[PDB]
Amino acid sequence: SLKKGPFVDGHLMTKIEKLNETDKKQVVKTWSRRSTIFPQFIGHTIAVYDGRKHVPVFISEDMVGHKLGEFAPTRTYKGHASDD
Amino acid sequence: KGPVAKRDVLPDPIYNSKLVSRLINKMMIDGKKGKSQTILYKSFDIIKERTGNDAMEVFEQALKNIMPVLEVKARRVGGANYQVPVEVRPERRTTLGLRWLVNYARLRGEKTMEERLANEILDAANNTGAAVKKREDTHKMAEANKAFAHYRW
Amino acid sequence: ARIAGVDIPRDKRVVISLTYIFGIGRTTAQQVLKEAGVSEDTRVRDLTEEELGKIRDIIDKLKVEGDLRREVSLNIKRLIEIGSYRGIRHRRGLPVRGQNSKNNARTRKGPRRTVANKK
Amino acid sequence: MKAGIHPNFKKATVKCACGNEFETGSVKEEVRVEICSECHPFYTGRQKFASADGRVDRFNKKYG
RNA sequence: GGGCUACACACGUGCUACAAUGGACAGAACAAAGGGCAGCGAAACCGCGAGGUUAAGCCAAUCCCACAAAUCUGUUCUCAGUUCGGAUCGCAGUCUGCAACUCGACUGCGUGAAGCUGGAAUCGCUAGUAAUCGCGGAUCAGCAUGCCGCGGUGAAUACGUUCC
What we know:
Chain A: InterPro entries: Ribosomal_uS19 (IPR002222), Ribosomal_uS19_bac-type (IPR005732), Ribosomal_uS19_CS (IPR020934), Ribosomal_uS19_SF (IPR023575). Chain A: One of its GO terms (biological process) is ribosomal small subunit assembly. Chain A: Keywords: Ribonucleoprotein, Ribosomal protein, RNA-binding, rRNA-binding. This is part of a larger assembly, with chains A (84 residues), B (153 residues), C (119 residues) and D (64 residues). Chain C has helices spanning 14-19, 26-36, 51-61, 65-81, 86-92, 106-109. Chain C has 119 residues and is mainly alpha-helical. With 64 residues, chain D is mostly beta strands. Chain C binds one RNA strand of 164 nucleotides through α1, α2, α4, α5 and α6.
């Protein structure tokens, strides 16, 4: 990125804000993987829309600046014939 | 077809003669007349430094010493190749002389390219070195097998 | 051996001699020598009995060989336990920065061999 | 102690860049030494030396 | 939102090198052509750099993109996986864009693969051609080692139709 600053679409902002202030709801899908993780966002688990299937993702304290959608690879491995 | 016209080279101011300009043409790489110029004048200087003698004289004796008298030419008339020895054209003589000269000078391995061109041209002056050895090898491939190229072809 | 960056060589000028240190590079060496005022000096290794020490201190401020290796190691270990995707590229043999795979990129893949044919 | 197999040991003078000195014994009359326990960061309490470990981890990234 | 960028591998086609005719540093010097108003953006200033702040001029033989590079002149390294080469990756920045994870470019710092000229085989070119050095444009928000052009430096050889 650059400066001022990391950019969530902003709906995730109010969502995680309301989820932080109250309710403590867990597991929620999102199509907007472009959004970066935030300190207020910590500890939540989001189903990430790779396209084929949502992949749930827990948020450790260590991850912030990495993109939220980065953790789930759309790519399928490998695929190769004769292993070993 | 027929023979093609060939341009004469602009004479080198030092040492006057056009043949040195032919060296400026052959020694040159990456199209740089100036790099050939510097290596040429430093070549004359290093010749001036060790064993004192006129550079043009040792150069003339060297070029006379590096021109083959005969050359083979392979031709597959049948099973296996058959080289045919033949008297060399003088332009081809100086061409082979200068080309094997610069080629063997390139591989001398000395830290200074000018000093190894010096060692090489003095080897040509002394009837020795890789160039004279190679002309001798061409002399061996020739004469010994000139019988197929006696007056047949 | 040696006084600053461990195992600096010999019979070489001081700048390239401490570029070999796992930490300082070329321009950083230009900076530490700019602080030094040595002027190069010395082609071999003969600096000065105390100036070698004051330079040893400034180099000591910079950090640091195998611990710097521990920095990159702990960093990539941070990059694998985090999930992940970047360390995933680090151990697939996949290039990490993002430059295809359909051709070349043999820096991690290695040379040999081949196991396919048609038809 | 076999004679002529064991090299002679004159009283050593260990030294260091920090000017620290140690009186021991060695084959050499004098012994300059690049590093001593009185200079090495680990033996000398818990000096910052160059770290300042954990700065920063696992997170501290904010800019406004 | 992905994918068109897959990845055990094969092939085609380019780029960069494997170095002392060289590398690195400093100084000095010679171009052509093309583009520019939803643009080119000088100069001044800030940042090591990329760029930013600010803003003159230019609808352009006026001004801007813009500095030509090889080269030359000296200093330095003295033949080695190297002050050779730059890969890969880490960290920290930056331009464009709602937005640079997939899958952008650039910079600073750090890391310093392989490669010391390449088997069988194969390609181009008869002179300003080959060799090589830089520049511009179409493309285009951003992205040009591709393509199309511009100029600099600038050869070797052609006996001949035996053979392909």
